[PDB]
Structure 1
Amino acid sequence: TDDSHDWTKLRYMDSHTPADAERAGLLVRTSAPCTITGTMGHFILARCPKGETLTVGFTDSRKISHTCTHPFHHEPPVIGRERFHSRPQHGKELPCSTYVQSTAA
């Protein structure tokens, strides 16, 4: 609540009060819990398994978990010709398009 740059706290509104919580409080899932890479501003960037839904949650300063969901069907598109499994030892270098970790775009 004082324009900080830390890797600990995060703001959330409560009855005209910005209050703080921790990055370990939030959690995202579609089928399994995802994994978190990019945390800045209003924006959170994850990689996540094959998706039917999406669910986002965090926990209060009073430890009450506010966790709610959004309807969105997530399928990663294939690359190449192979409905593949994960990233293996054998990779052919085929083009793709990813977000970067530049906090100032």
Structure 2
Amino acid sequence: TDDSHDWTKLRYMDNHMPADAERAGLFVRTSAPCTITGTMGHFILARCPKG
């Protein structure tokens, strides 16, 4: 939120003000969970099964 690089932290909007969250909490899924292979800003890279 203070505009600083931290790979273990996440920045989301929470009712008019931006708040901090955890990188471990982030998940991607189609029919089964997906393996995250890159995260930076608004972008997420993932390999997903048939969904």
**Is the TM value for this pair above 0.5?**
yes
CA distance in 2, matches of 1:18, 1:33: 27
CA distance in 2, matches of 1:48, 1:42: 18
Aligned-residue Cα RMSD (Å) equals 0.8
After TM superposition, give the deviation of residue 20 of structure 1 in Å: 0.7
Which gives a bigger RCO, structure 1 or 2 (Cα 8 Å, sep 6+)? Answer: 2
After TM superposition, give the deviation of residue 28 of structure 1 in Å: 1.1
Gaps of 5+ in 2: none
TM-score normalised by structure 2 residue count: 0.86
CA distance in 1, matches of 2:32, 2:4: 32
CA distance in 2, matches of 1:4, 1:37: 22
Of Structure 1 and Structure 2, the greater strand share is in 2
Structure 2 residue 43 is matched with structure 1 residue 35: no
CA distance in 1, matches of 2:19, 2:8: 13
After TM superposition, give the deviation of residue 15 of structure 1 in Å: 1.4
CA distance in 2, matches of 1:22, 1:32: 21
Partner SS, residue 28 of structure 1: coil
Identity of aligned residues (%): 94
CA distance in 1, matches of 2:23, 2:15: 22
Gaps of 5+ in 1: 50-105
Computing the radius of gyration from Cα coordinates, the structure with the larger value is 1
